[PDB]
Design a protein around this ligand. Structure first.
Ligand SMILES: [Zn+2]
Ligand SMILES: [Zn+2]
Lengths: 715, 112
């Protein structure tokens, strides 16, 4: 009396999703009444951005998923009591949660559940597996828990869920990530916290505050923070009954929403779906150019990851970052050029970043930095302030500058296209691939829907350089600070304060780099899945056949990191899946002889991975494959690539779209546009060449010459 | 530095005059150890509530008549101001006059 499909088919249908070959998923959703058959006649019914209602439909599997998790725990107790030692898989459990191994001794058995839960984990937040746990007796048929608003810990509640659903997940769990021994353990626990936190009140999270006194006068300040992913982190340098506040203490308090929200108006905003905290209150059209030319976060969902895979992939991702330098620098080693940048609320009511950088001494800047290595400051941004950026550079700038100064590396940030740079970057990705094809793709909602787990992974990767300057506790507080400042900070909109659910921040020091850590992670994930998901017995090449076997056993077995395997896997990807990565922008030169066999990721692996990793569907409309390397990538750094003759040799040149260019010291702007338009004169279409010439005429009337422009592509 | 220092102190003291009250003492004193979430303080210390309503149907289900319930308290409406910063009377918010209102409207209410 088993169902037609197994838990394995539900997981596969959701994780290896293809909108074409989606029959397994459609049948399961209709079979269990998540939706009717007509549901699948909707245009883009499977998307998460369009037809957002798909989440209501996936959620109808949530009761079924928790029943399967509960049956697993009961199964595991039974095999333990029976003295049975063995492994749990998803093809031995049906969709009603029913189960269908050796005996050693009564009372001495043990399940192996590392692949069992890791395979399920990515769909537990998608299907809202714990939706019932917000109810009094964990029953959807009854009323909701009248949670005490003043409760802020939830340690026991997370432990109760852990031992109810993941009882046999035999790895140490630290609800409060502050107690983790390394970065791997941090990601291990945070992944559970993401799921458990889905049933705690939205008001229980965020800055935690206390009444403190200065000169006998009470203040409400943050003395810690409750993170959905990290648990509760308390501050240490909390001083009451002080006489006066120092400049540094005033910056910390001014930046701290505790003083602004607790003292503001209550806010009920019905125009949105986002959680708010308090109200604090009660283009340049260039006509001359135009006339001349004419004459001629609501989608960021809690997302749980396959931890066994995430902890493998992160080691591979780290290998891709094993070429640049990093570490901590002091305040007087920090380079800041954008001193005209807004200091952020409330500092932007007084001035620009220059006002603060020229006020604090380097000793004070180091002291503020040190504060963030022991405590958490939950700053306010506006729709990233100085109490965050002044310390983020001291922690990350050496690495960010190292990446930006390195050429030939997989992650290419800050490398000019000029003087042969475009050409050299293309030759670097092409490398020695045996049967090269070029691939690229977009990332829908990359700056909005990116999960906090992958944002944490990326900040941990950038922080893995701090080995000779930071201890464990300090690395954790810095993580807590980055999370409080850019993943779940307060953002002022209009005159009111709102809570950010997750995603990225364009005002931060690391976004352009964290996005590349992410791009690699998703690509590695796609390759790990492309190979592990194929039939290992259909591989003619003994080498790869053994690589697939050992890869599986380096994720769901052998928890200790096998560095030799990771170096080999890394080298495999380097040889057959060559990446060139810019913040959320990548070109892949891959060996199609292997991709054809499923041994290398292709565009279909990226589509399936983004579908479950970032909860977004990636349209073929923005995806591309190019089979002839005579032409370059269809679009990279928002520019098209062509091979042209230059120097009785041939070079690759970038060029933006001609219409985009015309649509776009005023003369300096026009000179830059003319330079970007220059390569269009090498294009066979005269209409493209004319864009460049149009600008030269405009510029001269406003000396840019053909020689002063062609020099930009001469090494 | 002094100009910034003064600005921070001035701002913090302005907020302290608004913040130091009985409601704050009640929420902190009810804490098990003196600590509460920040996101629940305004629910006890804010005597005034701002409600932003995008249309008539929402208005009816949010602020219909002189009073409404929010954050487990009864609120009394003092004033309604529209998107063009004009004063709107409660008697003017109905279905027939809906097309003539500069939605969203902002409703100001005090704890009953
Ligand atoms: Zn841990
Ligand atoms: Zn360090």
């Amino acid at each position: 009396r088993l169902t037609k499909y197994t838990m394995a088919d539900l997981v596969y249908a959701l994780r290896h999703f293809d909108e074409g070959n989606c029959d397994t998923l459609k049948e399961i959703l209709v079979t269990y009444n998540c939706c009717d058959d007509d549901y699948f006649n909707k245009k883009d019914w499977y998307d998460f951005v369009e037809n957002p209602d798909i989440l209501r439909v996936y959620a109808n599997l949530g009761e079924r998923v928790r029943q399967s998790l509960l049956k697993t725990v009961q199964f595991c107790d039974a095999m333990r009591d029976a003295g049975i030692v063995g492994v749990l898989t998803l093809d031995n459990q049906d969709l009603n949660g029913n189960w269908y191994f050796v005996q050693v001794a009564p009372g001495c058995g043990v399940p192996i559940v590392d692949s069992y839960y890791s395979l399920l984990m990515p769909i537990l937040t998608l299907t809202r597996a714990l939706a019932a746990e917000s109810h009094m007796d964990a029953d959807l048929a009854k009323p909701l828990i009248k949670w005490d608003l003043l409760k802020y810990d939830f340690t026991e509640e997370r432990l109760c869920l852990f031992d109810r659903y993941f009882k046999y997940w035999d790895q140490t769990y630290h609800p409060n990530c502050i107690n983790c021994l390394d970065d791997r353990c941090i990601l291990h626990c945070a992944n559970f916290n993401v799921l458990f936190s889905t049933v705690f009140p939205p008001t229980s999270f965020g800055p935690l505050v206390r009444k403190i006194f200065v000169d006998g006068v009470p203040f409400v300040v943050s003395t810690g923070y409750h993170f959905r992913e990290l648990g509760v982190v308390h501050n240490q340098d909390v001083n009451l009954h002080s006489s006066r506040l120092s400049f540094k203490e005033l910056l910390v308090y001014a930046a701290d929403p505790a003083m602004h929200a607790a003292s503001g108006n209550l806010l009920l905003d019905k125009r949105t779906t986002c959680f708010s905290v308090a109200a604090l209150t009660n283009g340049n059209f260039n006509k001359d150019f135009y006339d001349f030319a004419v004459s001629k976060y609501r989608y960021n969902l809690p997302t749980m990851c396959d931890i066994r895979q995430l902890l493998f992939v992160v080691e591979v991702v780290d290998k891709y970052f094993d070429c640049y330098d990093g570490g901590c620098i002091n305040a007087n080693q920090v380079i800041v050029n954008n001193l005209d940048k807004s200091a952020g609320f409330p500092f932007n009511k007084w001035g620009k970043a220059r006002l603060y950088y020229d006020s604090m001494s380097y000793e004070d800047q180091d002291a503020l930095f040190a504060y963030t290595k022991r405590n958490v400051i939950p700053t306010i941004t506006q729709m990233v302030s100085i109490c965050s950026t002044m310390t983020n550079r001291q922690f990350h700038q050496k690495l960010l500058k190292s990446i930006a100064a390195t050429r030939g590396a997989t992650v290419v940030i800050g490398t000019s296209k000029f003087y042969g740079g475009w050409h050299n970057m293309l030759k670097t990705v092409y490398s020695d691939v045996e049967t090269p094809h070029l691939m690229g793709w977009d990332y829908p909602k990359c700056d909005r829907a990116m999960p906090n787990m992958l944002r944490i992974m990326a900040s941990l990767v950038l922080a893995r350089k701090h080995n000779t300057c930071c201890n464990l506790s300090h690395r954790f507080y810095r993580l807590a600070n980055e999370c409080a400042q850019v993943l779940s900070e307060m953002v002022m909109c209009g005159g009111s304060l709102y809570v950010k659910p997750g995603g990225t921040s364009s005002g931060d020091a690391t976004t352009a780099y964290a996005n590349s850590v992410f791009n690699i992670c998703q690509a590695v994930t796609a390759n790990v899945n492309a190979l592990l998901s194929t039939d290992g017995n259909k591989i003619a090449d003994k080498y790869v056949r053994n690589l697939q076997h050992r890869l599986y056993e380096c994720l769901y077995r052998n928890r200790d990191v096998d560095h030799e395997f990771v170096d080999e896997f890394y080298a495999y990807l380097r040889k057959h899946f060559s990446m060139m990565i810019l913040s959320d922008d990548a070109v892949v030169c891959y060996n199609s002889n292997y991709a054809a066999q499923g041994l290398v990721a292709s565009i279909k692996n990226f589509k399936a991975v983004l579908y479950y990793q970032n909860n977004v569907f990636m349209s073929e409309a923005k995806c591309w494959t190019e089979t002839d390397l005579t032409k370059g990538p269809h679009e990279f750094c928002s520019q098209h690539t062509m091979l042209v003759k230059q120097g009785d040799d041939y070079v690759y040149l970038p060029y933006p779209d001609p219409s985009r260019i015309l649509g776009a010291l005023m003369i300096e702007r026009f000179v830059s546009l003319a330079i970007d338009a220059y390569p269009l004169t090498k294009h066979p279409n005269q209409e493209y060449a004319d864009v460049f010439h149009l600008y030269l005429q405009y510029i001269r009337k406003l000396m840019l010459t053909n020689d002063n422009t062609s020099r930009y592509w001469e090494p | 530095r002094a100009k910034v220092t003064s600005a921070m102190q001035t701002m913090l003291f302005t907020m302290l005059r608004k913040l130091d009250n009985d409601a704050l003492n009640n929420i902190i004193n009810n804490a098990r150890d003196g600590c509460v979430p920040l996101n629940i303080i305004p629910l006890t210390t804010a005597a005034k509530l701002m409600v932003v309503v995008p249309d008539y149907g929402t208005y009816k289900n949010t602020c219909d008549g002189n009073t409404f319930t929010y954050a487990s308290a009864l609120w009394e409406i003092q004033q309604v101001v529209d998107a063009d910063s004009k004063i709107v009377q409660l008697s003017e918010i109905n279905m027939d006059n809906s097309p003539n209102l500069a939605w969203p409207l902002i409703v100001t209410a005090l704890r009953a």
